[PDB]
Structures are given as C-alpha cells and as structure tokens.
Amino acid sequence: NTKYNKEFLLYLAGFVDGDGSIIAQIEPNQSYKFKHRLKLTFKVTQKTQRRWFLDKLVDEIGVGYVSDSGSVSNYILSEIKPLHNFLTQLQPFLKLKQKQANLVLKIIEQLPSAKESPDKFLEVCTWVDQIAALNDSKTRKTTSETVRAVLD
Amino acid sequence: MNTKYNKEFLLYLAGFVDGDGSIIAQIKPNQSSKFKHRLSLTFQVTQKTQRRWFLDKLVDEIGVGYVRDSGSVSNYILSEIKPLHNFLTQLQPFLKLKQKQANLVLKIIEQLPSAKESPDKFLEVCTWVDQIAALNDSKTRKTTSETVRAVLD
DNA sequence: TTAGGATCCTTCAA
DNA sequence: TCTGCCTTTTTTGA
DNA sequence: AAAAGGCAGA
C-alpha cells in the first residue's frame, strides 16, 4: 500500500471531481453464486490528445492502466485492494464524489460477507444503487431490484 | 483587493479547473472600440445546475465573479481584469493542463494598457489570443488575429 | 466460481 | 468608448 | 467547454 503525497491528492481530488467517475455495477452472470457479480471502477476520462496526462497518472498512482477508445482515453483502476487503498487516501479531499468513494469503500469491506448470504448480497446491491443515484446515471439496467429475483 | 488565496484551496481548485474549467480569450468585433474590436478574457467553471451550490461557493471563495444558468447547466464566471489577474497568478503554479492558457492570459492583461496605443501592438496581443484558442479544444471560433488584420485602413 | 480485463454504447455536462 | 454583465449556441469530451 | 453575441451606465 503506497502512501500518496498530500499535495498530489489535493490536486487529483479536484481533477477527479471534474473529469473522473466512481462507478459500481451489478452484472448478471449465471456462473456466480447469486447469478450476478459486483464490479467497482475508478475512471478518469480525457480526449486521446491528452492521453499523456493519463499515462502520468498510471505512474503516479502506481497501479491501473490506460485504454484508448479512439476519440477518448480512460485511466482505469478496478483491482479491489489497490482501489481501496487509493480511495481511502483520496476521499478526504473529494467534494463532489466523496459519498460515492465512501460507498465504494464500504462495499469493498463487505465483499467477503456478501458472497455468503443472499440477504447480505442484496443489501450490498442497494449501496450500488446509491452510488448510481449520486452519479448522473442515464443508461443503467441492472439494479438491486433486478437481483431481488433471487426470490426464487 | 489582491485577495490572498490559500494553498489547499488553490491545489484542489487547480485540479477541478483542469477538469471542468475553461480559460478563454476572445476578440469581439465592436465598431465602437478604438480598433473595432474588444478583447475579452474569461475564467469559467461549468457544472450541471443541480450542483450550482459548488459554483456559488466559488463566488464566496474567490470573492468576486458570478454564476449564470443556461439550459441544464450553470457557470461561474470571472472576467474583471484586476481580480482575474490576481487569481490566475496564484492558481497558475498548480495547473497542469491549463497552465499555458493561464500564463497567456496574464501576459495579455499586462499588455492591455499599451495595446490601446498601436495597431501593431494590438495585433500582437491578438496573436496571443490565437495561441490560447489553439491550446483549448476550440471548435466554434470566428474572430481571429487575421480578422483583425484589416485594420488595413 | 470469481476477478479483472477487453470492447463498445448512450447521452449528456461540459 | 469602455467595461462589467448578460444570454445563447455549437459540438464535443466526457 | 469554448466560443458566439448583446445591453446600458459612466
């Protein structure tokens, strides 16, 4: 677990509150115990012209990668343990996405117990809804109520 | 009056401006100005109006400027030359993507007195406007230093 | 089964 | 003439 | 985001 410089975290928190996204998803999948998987992602988008700024993030954060979609590029961090460490340090400085960050942390902490009980998995799905409600969500499909058909 | 801004504020805000902000220089045709154009310099931060509270707070923090709504979004705007120069002076050290535009704005503001004095000097400052627009993701710009160049009266 | 990655779309919020 | 505000539009860059 | 414009008082 890298400890990040405070002045870097201050600047990055501002940048993230601007061009960043803290995303939580429920994805249907038949192979998973409760027929769904949780996915958590920290992302920063930039026009591919400024991909260099994202390549620098990779180096400064120490983990994650940059993916180019053509017009725009994304810094992506998904790996659970580094994500938890990163958001823990970032969160105090966030002003617009602080709640989403803290919901992500809470979800991560509950993942072990979420795989053992459908009631617990559902509850955790409800925190995912909460993150989506905080985001400017516009194309969401799978919600905790989708999951609530573990009511079989 | 030359408000002094605090370090942790400037650091966070520099980040946020590199994200959702814009540092804009324009040449506005206007027949009642000395050389038939007015230079306008703007610092702007955009956000969805549901988050206008964040922009209103920027008025309190920067201590000048104002917020306007427009469709589904809001903008903090600072265009007043003396405070804008003071603010960008202190913000610039921490900018990463918009540092050059901020410094060009400062250079422009410092030359304005003597831009009113020579057409050739007015033209050169206009080329600094050009450079800022180049650095930005410019897509609907119309009036450029070249427009100004006649002026060949 | 699980976790992370790869690839792409949708609709704005800049 | 000048300068602080205002008010809308275009096209993405998120 | 990054322009385009307009009005009015000093």
Add this chain to the structure above:
DNA sequence: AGGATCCTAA
C-alpha cells in the same frame, strides 16, 4: 462520464 456485455486465467 456512466454505464452495458463478452472473455478467460486463476
């Protein structure tokens, strides 16, 4: 920005 869906090593 904020999702969606497919894939495959572990």
